[PDB]
Amino acid sequence: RNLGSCGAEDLDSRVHPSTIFWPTEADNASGVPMRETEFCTHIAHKRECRICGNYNSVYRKYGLFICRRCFKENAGKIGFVKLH
Amino acid sequence: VHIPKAVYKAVYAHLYENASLALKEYWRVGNVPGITYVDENGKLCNPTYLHVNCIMQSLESRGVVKDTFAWRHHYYLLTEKGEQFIRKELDLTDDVLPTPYSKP
Amino acid sequence: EPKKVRLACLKYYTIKGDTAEPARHADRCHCG
Amino acid sequence: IVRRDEENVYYSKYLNDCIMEAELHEFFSRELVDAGYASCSLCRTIDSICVIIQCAEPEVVMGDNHYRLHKIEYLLAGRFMCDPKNFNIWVDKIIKRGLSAEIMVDNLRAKLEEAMPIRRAAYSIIRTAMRAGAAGCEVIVAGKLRANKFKEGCLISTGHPKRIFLAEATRHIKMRQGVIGVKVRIYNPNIRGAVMPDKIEIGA
Amino acid sequence: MHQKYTIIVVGKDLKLVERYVKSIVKEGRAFGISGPCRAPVRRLTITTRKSPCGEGTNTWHRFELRMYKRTFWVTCGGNDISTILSKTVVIPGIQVTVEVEEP
RNA sequence: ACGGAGGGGUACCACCAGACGUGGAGUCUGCGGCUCAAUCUGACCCAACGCGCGCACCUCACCAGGCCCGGACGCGCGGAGGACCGACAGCCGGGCGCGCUUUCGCGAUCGCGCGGGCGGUGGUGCAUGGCCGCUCCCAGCCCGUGGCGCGAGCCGUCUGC
RNA sequence: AGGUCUGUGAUGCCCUCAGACGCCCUGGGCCGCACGCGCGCUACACUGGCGGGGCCAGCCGGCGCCCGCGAGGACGCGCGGAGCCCCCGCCGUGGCCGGGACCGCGGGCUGGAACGCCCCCGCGCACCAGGAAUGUCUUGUAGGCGCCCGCCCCCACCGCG
Ligand SMILES: [Zn+2]
């Protein structure tokens, strides 16, 4: 299909090549381009606790990215202290 | 699955030189920022996560290295059997020794 | 699920080792 | 008068390094248990971090001329993407092992997995602590055997003084029948020469 | 020579962060290092349910982490980069008490 | 332990004296019931029902349909005289070399079976650890020596202020 | 035998494992409605509604110019805080200028994609202080008034303050 296409009059409607605004969160995977054609073509953020691979109930405040449940266990070492 | 030989050799060399692979738990599309390879590409091209993950699994299952997982990062370490096997695939001689033995 | 045939020495498009060649429409190795 | 997004880098730079550490604690606990690791730290150097550790058996952690320690040294570098060589771990030693909860709990866990039952191990541990100058210990073992506790002397369990004097630890044991939850708590009222409140003296 | 350099101290614990400045000012006894500005405390706050399953009376943990910081921009170019290293060595080694120098 | 038994005390999660309210309407939300292919599930007096930290796709288990092996490691048989893997063009397909119809390409990264895995928001919270809730917005709980009882137990640990 | 195996490289035993409960892609659903109630929000007006004006907070905090009625939009740089309330007028006991549910054209924002959210013109539902019953509260307290954070591509009648 590399030697085919649509009408020119329709091509004017092509989506603006301006890069998409829906990226994927990387806490720290090199951004690089059969089943490969659509293994995970759908693009969406996948923010998740950097401890447990769980995408539910994650704090993004201050750039933590820690599950609320897994927060209590490590809070003591992380520095947070329970007073007042 | 059809993993290139250049990737095999690159990973082996990186392992022996560093004695340590610090890998991330991933299974989607994406290349590794560390190890690298060149196949008439003009610029060293990095490997894909699926390839290296399968290679690491095979190696560890064969008893060449051991691992810890911590959280979100497979840490690997090659055993004596490791040094005794990579040197063969890199086609090395017993005299050579991993870098870390040389005052890190 | 396409099938395959046992390979034969047909690439010899000549009559005495004359290397004639290095099929419906045209096509090149790979897609280009 | 001042801009609030400049100091945000310094504030956010200090917080990242805090988490950078806890992962170290977890990893050491999963790896250098053999040497009974206790705790770690950090000291952001010019081009690296001067992490020092505390393990009761210093010899086990390091290898021939610290060879395995060197091995570990490179590993961390790639994980944090720091330059090797600049990494400079340090190794320390703990003197009063009968005053730390974690080494005792790890030894006790290993002993339990040596087929020996709870009673002997718990009494060995409490004897080891008391003979090491401790006001008291408390061993709790919970699992498929309920809760069978053992205790010797006086402990406090409420108030601000608890977090500084009392030191607790916990573990999990994967046994064929299930899981054996085990924890330990030690109350040393002479830590670092700190005066416990409502502790008075009068002279002649 | 002269660089209009700056000194910044960042940390969490009030005890060390207050003791360390005393040593610094000792070391700057003769180089003119003076009082530090003490910024308002950056009291970070987080709240969370105490129950992993959300049963019973709704209760809430309240953890907070403060970020004390002090600044000794006094040196500026008053000192040379030669002893700016000397400034950074005679000072005590505290395990966690991050610092950074900029002009 | 209980008592529509007595005596001492105590508390705006009890009352006296007051205040402000809800239940009456419209509406946000959750909970049962009905409906659908599905309307995913946990909890039901205090001690379930803006609570399991904001559901167009993911979140997501549920319904209609479709790609891939991403089957480690050992043993037996086969394999470069060719193991496995991709593709321009035309049709059917929501689309994909998904399938078919011709014919090119790639080369051991293996293929079949037997052992043996990894994985899984699948089940039992009446198999368990950990963490919370409640008893508890309480004032109570026990040790060594000694004494009393065959003994379970009692005194210590108070019918005073 | 309160809740949690559906928070986790926490886990025993069961069930699934090449037409998959694995991982991924396109759609739909979790919002669907004769009805019962639980925490809340808006009101039933003159101790008030509308217009113009003056003005002071704290957890803390980002602004200029130009188009557009408004929501919003193109540029360029580091700079900065409210409702109640007080003053002057209109309305004049009429379900009326109280009330803003519901509905019809239209203009914009996020996003690959509106079923999501804002602004403008028009229509203007019940509601005349709420039965049996029931909840909370003693000083900067109840009550009234507004302002920031959380999850968040957009949105707060919610929760923490
Ligand atoms: Zn977590």
Distance CA D86, CA D68 (A): 17
**CB of A35 lies under 7 Å from some atom of strand F:** yes
**CB of E63 lies under 7 Å from some atom of strand G:** no
Q: Across-strand partners of E71?
A: E8, E37
Range(s) of the domain holding residue A50: 36-83
Disruptive mutation site among A30, A71, A77, A81 for chain D (greatest number of D CBs within 10 Å)? A77
Q: Exposure pattern of B59-95 as b/e (b: 16+ CB <10 Å)?
A: beeeebbeeeebbbbbbbbbeeebbebbbeeeeeeee
Range(s) of the domain holding residue D128: 101-187
* Minimum distance, in Å, between the CA of residue B33 and any CA atom of chain A: 6
Looking at the fold, whether D124 and D85 belong to one and the same domain comes out as: no
Q: D145 and chain A: CB distance < 8 Å anywhere? A: no
CA A14 vs. chain centroid, Å, equals 25
Closest residue by Cα to residue D121 from D131, D108, D134, D133: D108
Any chains having at least 3 CB pairs less than 8 A from chain B are A, D
CA dihedral D108, D126, D134, D179 (to 10 degrees): 40
- CB–CB contact D23 B71 (8 Å): yes
CA dihedral E100, A77, E91, D14 (to 10 degrees): 10
Asked if the structure places residue B29 within a domain, the reply is yes
Structural domain count, chain B: 1
Distance CA C30, CA B77 (A): 41
For tokens 């350099």, the residue is E5
Structural domain count, chain D: 2
- CB < 8 Å & 24+ apart, contacts of B77-85: B77/B19, B77/B20, B77/D71, B77/D75, B78/B15, B78/B16, B78/B19, B82/B15, B83/B16
Interface of A with D (CB under 8 A): 28, 62-64, 74, 77-79
Q: Which experiment gave this structure?
A: cryo-EM
Mutual angle of helices B5-18 and B80-89, in 10-degree steps = 140
What's D46's domain CATH number?
Answer: 3.30.300.20
Q: Exposure pattern of E21-32 as b/e (b: 16+ CB <10 Å)?
A: beebeebbeebe
Sign of the Cα pseudo-torsion (D23, D75, D15, D48, in order): positive
For tokens 């020119």, the residue is A8
Resolution (A): 3.2
Asked if the structure places residue D202 within a domain, the reply is no
Asked if the structure places residue D3 within a domain, the reply is no
For tokens 């560890």, the residue is B60
Asked if the structure places residue B102 within a domain, the reply is no
CB A25 within 8 A of CB A43: no
What's D130's domain CATH number?
Answer: 3.30.1140.32
Looking at the fold, whether D66 and D141 belong to one and the same domain comes out as: no
Q: How far is the CA of E88 from the centre of ligand 1 (A)?
A: 39
Looking at the fold, whether D14 and D81 belong to one and the same domain comes out as: yes
Looking at the fold, whether D84 and D129 belong to one and the same domain comes out as: no
Tell me which residues from 54 to 93 on chain E have a beta carbon below 7 angstroms from nucleic acid strand F. 54-59
Distance CA B49, CA B33 (A): 10
Distance CA E38, CA E68 (A): 8
Looking at the fold, whether D107 and D51 belong to one and the same domain comes out as: no
Residues of chain D positioned with their CB less than 8 A from the CB of B52? none
Asked if the structure places residue D25 within a domain, the reply is yes
